[PDB]
């Protein structure tokens, strides 16, 4: 990092207005149908969203006990933006270490906790359930069969990308990126706060982004300087943020923080979803960092549309039968 992250936090130049502040009750399927979920949204309170969070003083040690001391967790080395691995108990020890005693800055942004005890303590906005491709398109008997609580790909029966716990110490920074597969993201500040720099997915900015990734010079160039327009915005405790497909964003953590969030594909911005996927392909992102079973999901999406509209199934007999049995529960 040869740019000064402190001036990027102090300057007033990232003054675009992209985010809409909304009340939870107006975030519904009609709103999505009319707008296509094209605008980043902040919900300053959770009234009307249908979320559920754990107890407000929930700690990292509580997360640890819910997912298991021995769960392997991907950790990001902030200085390099590379990954390492440790146990949740090891992560917890690092997180409980006083700031002055931590050798390096590490961030956990990728702890997917579906099928652990923590799962029922967190519920995402209701409207998301109505439009998530996982919930609405993936064969239900496959989803229900998942037993593995890690993101081990050989055990994964569906795209396990719905509920993530992020645990970030003061000073953490995640450099500019687009969330995997062109997913949209909901993000709830349970405790602490985050600062986002937001860059819109115009064709020009997405070319800059790809070029910046292909250059390998991401430590040298702050991308938010290279673009047409960028909003820097602070999310405070209790806010819920929705990020549309394709938005290029970087994040700074000004205080120790705990976040619950998750990813979803939906039927209202498919072109952008595909566009992001093709940037991943061209910049050679390893499959580990991508949306699992992406094209598979897309096939199932086509089938559901055909079936729901025409009543003609393109599922195997056996999958039709599995679906019929579930309709009768």
């Amino acid at each position: 990092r040869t740019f000064d992250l402190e001036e990027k936090l102090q300057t007033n130049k990232y003054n675009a207005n992209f985010v809409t502040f909304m009340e939870g009750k107006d975030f519904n399927v009609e709103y999505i149908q009319r707008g296509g979920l094209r605008d980043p949204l902040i919900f300053k309170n959770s009234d009307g969203l249908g979320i559920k969070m754990p107890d407000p003083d929930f700690t990292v040690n509580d997360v640890k006990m819910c997912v298991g001391s021995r769960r392997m967790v991907d950790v990001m080395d902030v200085n390099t933006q590379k990954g390492i691995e440790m146990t949740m108990a090891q992560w917890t020890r690092y997180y409980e270490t006083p700031e002055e005693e931590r050798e390096k800055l590490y961030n956990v942004i990728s702890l997917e906790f579906s099928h652990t005890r923590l799962e029922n303590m967190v519920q995402r906005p209701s409207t998301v359930d109505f439009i998530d491709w996982v919930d609405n398109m993936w064969p239900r008997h496959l989803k229900e069969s998942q037993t593995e609580s890690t993101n081990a790909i050989l055990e994964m029966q569906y795209p396990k990308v719905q509920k993530y716990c992020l645990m970030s110490v003061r000073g953490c920074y995640t450099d500019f990126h687009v969330d995997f597969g062109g997913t949209s993201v909901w993000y709830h500040i349970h405790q602490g706060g985050k600062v986002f720099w937001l860059i819109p997915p115009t064709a020009h900015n997405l070319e800059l982004y790809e070029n910046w990734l292909l250059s390998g010079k991401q430590g040298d160039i702050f991308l938010g300087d290279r673009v047409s327009d960028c909003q820097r915005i602070e999310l405070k405790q209790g806010y819920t943020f929705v990020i549309p497909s394709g938005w290029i964003h970087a994040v700074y953590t000004p205080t120790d923080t705990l976040v619950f969030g998750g990813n979803f594909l939906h039927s209202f911005n498919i072109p952008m979803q595909l566009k992001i996927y093709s940037i991943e392909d061209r910049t050679r992102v390893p499959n580990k960092f991508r949306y699992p079973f992406y094209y598979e999901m897309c096939w199932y999406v086509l089938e559901r549309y055909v079936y729901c509209i025409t009543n003609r199934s393109h599922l195997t007999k056996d999958f039709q039968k599995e679906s019929l049995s579930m309709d009768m529960e």
């Binding site: 991907d74 990001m76 933006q81 990954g83 942004i109 990728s110 997917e112 890690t150 993101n151 081990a152 790909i153 050989l154 994964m156 795209p159 396990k160 990308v161 993530y164 995640t174 450099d175 500019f176 990126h177 969330d179 995997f180 990734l213 991401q218 990813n263 992102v285 499959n287 580990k288 960092f289 991508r290 949306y291 699992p292 079973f293």
Partner: peptide, 11 residues
């Protein structure tokens, strides 16, 4: 090591 999927990280 077993392969994983759905890991959030830049680059």
């Amino acid at each position: 090591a077993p392969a994983t999927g759905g890991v959030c990280k830049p680059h």
